[PDB]
Design an enzyme around this catalytic site. Structure first.
Site, PDB file in Angstrom:
ATOM      1  N   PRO A  22       0.959  -1.229   0.077  1.00 54.90           N
ATOM      2  CA  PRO A  22      -0.053   0.013  -0.104  1.00 54.90           C
ATOM      3  C   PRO A  22       0.933   1.359  -0.017  1.00 54.90           C
ATOM      4  CG  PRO A  22       0.087  -1.056   2.228  1.00 54.90           C
ATOM      5  CD  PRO A  22       0.662  -1.992   1.277  1.00 54.90           C
ATOM      6  N   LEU A  23       0.787   2.050  -0.701  1.00 54.88           N
ATOM      7  CA  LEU A  23       1.398   3.452  -0.976  1.00 54.88           C
ATOM      8  C   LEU A  23       0.706   4.604  -1.271  1.00 54.88           C
ATOM      9  CD1 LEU A  23       3.419   1.923  -3.963  1.00 54.88           C
ATOM     10  CD2 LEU A  23       4.598   2.712  -1.299  1.00 54.88           C
ATOM     11  N   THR A  24       0.612   5.519  -0.014  1.00 57.10           N
ATOM     12  CA  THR A  24      -0.215   6.708   0.031  1.00 57.10           C
ATOM     13  C   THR A  24       0.454   7.841  -0.986  1.00 57.10           C
ATOM     14  OG1 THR A  24      -0.822   6.500   2.421  1.00 57.10           O
ATOM     15  CG2 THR A  24      -0.431   8.785   1.742  1.00 57.10           C
ATOM     16  N   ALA A  55      -3.492   3.351   2.188  1.00 59.35           N
ATOM     17  CA  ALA A  55      -4.433   3.706   3.427  1.00 59.35           C
ATOM     18  C   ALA A  55      -5.581   4.447   3.081  1.00 59.35           C
ATOM     19  CB  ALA A  55      -3.428   4.449   4.562  1.00 59.35           C
ATOM     20  N   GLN A  97      -6.624  -1.200   2.001  1.00 57.26           N
ATOM     21  CA  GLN A  97      -5.835  -1.190   3.207  1.00 57.26           C
ATOM     22  C   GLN A  97      -7.087  -0.233   3.953  1.00 57.26           C
ATOM     23  OE1 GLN A  97      -2.529   1.047   4.194  1.00 57.26           O
ATOM     24  NE2 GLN A  97      -1.734  -0.787   5.210  1.00 57.26           N
ATOM     25  N   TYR A 176      -0.541   4.213  13.369  1.00 59.44           N
ATOM     26  CA  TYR A 176      -1.691   4.653  13.398  1.00 59.44           C
ATOM     27  C   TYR A 176      -2.528   3.956  14.445  1.00 59.44           C
ATOM     28  CZ  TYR A 176       0.097   6.754   9.509  1.00 59.44           C
ATOM     29  OH  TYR A 176       1.158   7.563   8.582  1.00 59.44           O
ATOM     30  N   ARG A 223      -1.969  -5.920   8.467  1.00 60.10           N
ATOM     31  CA  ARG A 223      -0.642  -5.512   8.425  1.00 60.10           C
ATOM     32  C   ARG A 223      -0.018  -5.098   9.637  1.00 60.10           C
ATOM     33  NH1 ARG A 223       2.836  -1.123   4.359  1.00 60.10           N
ATOM     34  NH2 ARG A 223       4.135  -2.940   3.410  1.00 60.10           N
ATOM     35  N   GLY A 310       7.293  -2.253  -2.264  1.00 64.70           N
ATOM     36  CA  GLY A 310       6.698  -0.714  -2.253  1.00 64.70           C
ATOM     37  C   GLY A 310       7.290   0.298  -3.340  1.00 64.70           C
TER      38      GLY A 310
HETATM   39  C1  LIG Z   1       5.407   7.244  -0.556  1.00 69.37           C
HETATM   40  C2  LIG Z   1       5.037   5.790   0.405  1.00 69.37           C
HETATM   41  C3  LIG Z   1       3.651   5.966   0.854  1.00 69.37           C
HETATM   42  C4  LIG Z   1       3.255   4.674   1.694  1.00 69.37           C
HETATM   43  N1  LIG Z   1       1.897   4.476   2.193  1.00 69.37           N
HETATM   44  C5  LIG Z   1       1.648   3.535   3.024  1.00 69.37           C
HETATM   45  C6  LIG Z   1       0.366   3.361   3.479  1.00 69.37           C
HETATM   46  O1  LIG Z   1      -0.504   3.938   2.863  1.00 69.37           O
HETATM   47  N2  LIG Z   1       0.160   2.197   4.186  1.00 69.37           N
HETATM   48  C7  LIG Z   1       1.258   1.349   4.654  1.00 69.37           C
HETATM   49  O2  LIG Z   1       1.006   0.415   5.311  1.00 69.37           O
HETATM   50  N3  LIG Z   1       2.391   1.396   4.052  1.00 69.37           N
HETATM   51  C8  LIG Z   1       2.727   2.571   3.151  1.00 69.37           C
HETATM   52  N4  LIG Z   1       4.024   2.742   3.051  1.00 69.37           N
HETATM   53  C9  LIG Z   1       5.005   1.851   3.169  1.00 69.37           C
HETATM   54  C10 LIG Z   1       5.142   0.817   2.283  1.00 69.37           C
HETATM   55  O3  LIG Z   1       3.883   0.018   2.107  1.00 69.37           O
HETATM   56  C11 LIG Z   1       6.120  -0.002   2.075  1.00 69.37           C
HETATM   57  O4  LIG Z   1       6.205  -0.741   3.456  1.00 69.37           O
HETATM   58  C12 LIG Z   1       7.651   0.593   2.026  1.00 69.37           C
HETATM   59  O5  LIG Z   1       7.708   1.387   0.997  1.00 69.37           O
HETATM   60  C13 LIG Z   1       8.894  -0.391   2.380  1.00 69.37           C
HETATM   61  O6  LIG Z   1       8.933  -1.249   1.177  1.00 69.37           O
HETATM   62  P1  LIG Z   1       9.990  -1.385   0.106  1.00 69.37           P
HETATM   63  O7  LIG Z   1      11.138  -1.724   0.495  1.00 69.37           O
HETATM   64  O8  LIG Z   1       9.568  -2.441  -0.706  1.00 69.37           O
HETATM   65  O9  LIG Z   1       9.783   0.144  -0.843  1.00 69.37           O
HETATM   66  C14 LIG Z   1       4.321   3.774   2.098  1.00 69.37           C
HETATM   67  C15 LIG Z   1       5.564   4.009   1.747  1.00 69.37           C
HETATM   68  C16 LIG Z   1       6.066   5.114   0.708  1.00 69.37           C
HETATM   69  C17 LIG Z   1       7.411   5.071   0.351  1.00 69.37           C
END
Ligand SMILES: Cc1cc2nc3c(=O)[nH]c(=O)nc-3n(C[C@H](O)[C@H](O)[C@H](O)COP(=O)(O)O)c2cc1C
Ligand code: NA
Length: 357
Positions: A22-24, A55, A97, A176, A223, A310
């Site tokens: 999930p990526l905000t 999220a 999510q 959160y 998660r 991510g």
């Molecule tokens: C721009 C951005 C937005 C993110 N938004 C969320 C989110 O909405 N919900 C969540 O659980 N984690 C969020 N994360 C954490 C990511 O899901 C992920 O765990 C993190 O990027 C590490 O994974 P990776 O090493 O594969 O990048 C976000 C990360 C980034 C960088």
């Protein structure tokens, strides 16, 4: 198995184990309704075995990021349905999510409303961008108010079903609301939602109970981030915390447990993956810092069933094909993670676009 072996997740068949975390990205509109941009962005990534959409605000009036999406209103259900239809038309699978920001919901983002938390203690190791401002002291939720939070997650889960998702992921991580109750550095309260691990986990487990009533348990994931220091989070014994939760979550027959294995800030270290895999009998999805080679290694060893990526999936719409063929990845531009507009959102190229048609 390896990254490209199909996997059962609930009663879904995922085509591969290259999942999108999930990526905000704060590209929803001012009413927190998903936009045309989000439809295109997720559709571009539908070759993922599973997309976990960012999220999404379960309950009205709990903004932490200004332009995040919601799933509490009818316009939001209709907007998300455009997204899920576009992903399904490409043959992908997508979970939502569902999230409550807790003490990260700054008053200035919510018309002066005081955010809620298990205890009246502010975040101190992060700031909010609104200008850049210190977080405020949240109000301690009374025991008698916790039923309305549970009901809010139940309604969010019903709305996510109507919007056409394949399932929901409950956001129990990253500081959160549910994670604040879970970890004792943020939860100092007394009574049935504080103290020992089983009480601190009560709110998360009560949410999982109602969301599973809506969906059936094989469509619900959770998660967890037991070592993440983000948003002033710490547990005094993360190994004991994840061991207890790994055992207890067997009773919920979930689609998966999505475990973030390390600390964004690099301050807390422990091996949490080993005792989670030993005690959790279900589908284990791991996240944080996995390359294609490491991900194949840990799936083939049997230590995880799938890997959520991510930043690599943010920057590579065709990440599964790139990892399959051992092709270089596009580089992410953090400057546009949270901006408005298509730049740095829908304009990362595929392999074939790179080749310039
Ligand atoms: C721009 C951005 C937005 C993110 N938004 C969320 C989110 O909405 N919900 C969540 O659980 N984690 C969020 N994360 C954490 C990511 O899901 C992920 O765990 C993190 O990027 C590490 O994974 P990776 O090493 O594969 O990048 C976000 C990360 C980034 C960088
Ligand atoms: Na209070």
């Amino acid at each position: 198995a390896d990254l490209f072996t199909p996997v059962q997740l609930g009663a879904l068949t995922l085509a591969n184990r290259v999942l999108m975390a999930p990526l905000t990205r704060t590209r929803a509109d001012a009413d927190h309704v998903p936009t045309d941009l989000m439809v295109e962005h997720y559709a571009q990534r539908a070759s993922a075995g599973l997309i976990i959409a960012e999220a999404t605000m379960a309950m009205e009036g709990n903004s932490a990021f200004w332009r995040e999406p919601g799933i509490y209103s009818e316009a939001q259900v209709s907007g998300w349905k455009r997204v899920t239809d576009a992903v399904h038309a490409k043959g992908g699978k997508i979970f939502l999510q569902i999230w409550h920001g807790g003490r990260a919901c700054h008053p200035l983002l919510n018309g002066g409303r005081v955010p809620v938390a298990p205890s009246a203690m502010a975040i101190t190791n992060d700031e909010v961008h609104t200008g850049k401002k210190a977080y405020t002291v949240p109000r301690e939720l009374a025991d008698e108010e916790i039923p309305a939070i549970i009901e809010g997650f139940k309604v969010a889960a019903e709305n996510a079903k109507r919007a056409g998702f394949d399932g929901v992921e409950v956001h129990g991580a990253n500081g959160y609301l549910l994670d604040e109750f879970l970890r004792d550095g943020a939860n100092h309260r007394k009574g049935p939602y504080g103290g020992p691990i089983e009480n601190r986990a009560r709110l998360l487990l009560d949410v999982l109970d109602v969301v599973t009533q809506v969906w059936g348990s094989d469509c619900v994931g959770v998660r967890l981030s037991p070592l993440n220091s983000f948003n002033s989070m710490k547990d005094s014994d993360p190994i004991a915390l994840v061991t207890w939760l790994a055992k207890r979550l067997n009773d919920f027959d979930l689609a998966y447990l999505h475990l973030m294995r390390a600390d964004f800030l690099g301050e807390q270290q422990a091996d949490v993956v080993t005792p989670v895999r030993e005690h959790y009998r279900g589908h284990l999805m791991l996240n944080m810092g996995y390359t294609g080679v490491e991900a194949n290694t840990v799936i083939a060893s049997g230590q995880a069933d799938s890997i959520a990526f991510g930043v690599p999936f943010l920057a590579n719409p065709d990440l599964p094909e790139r990892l399959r063929n051992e092709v270089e990845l596009n580089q992410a531009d953090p400057a546009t993670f949270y901006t408005q507009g298509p730049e740095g959102y829908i304009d990362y190229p595929t392999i074939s676009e790179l080749a310039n048609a």
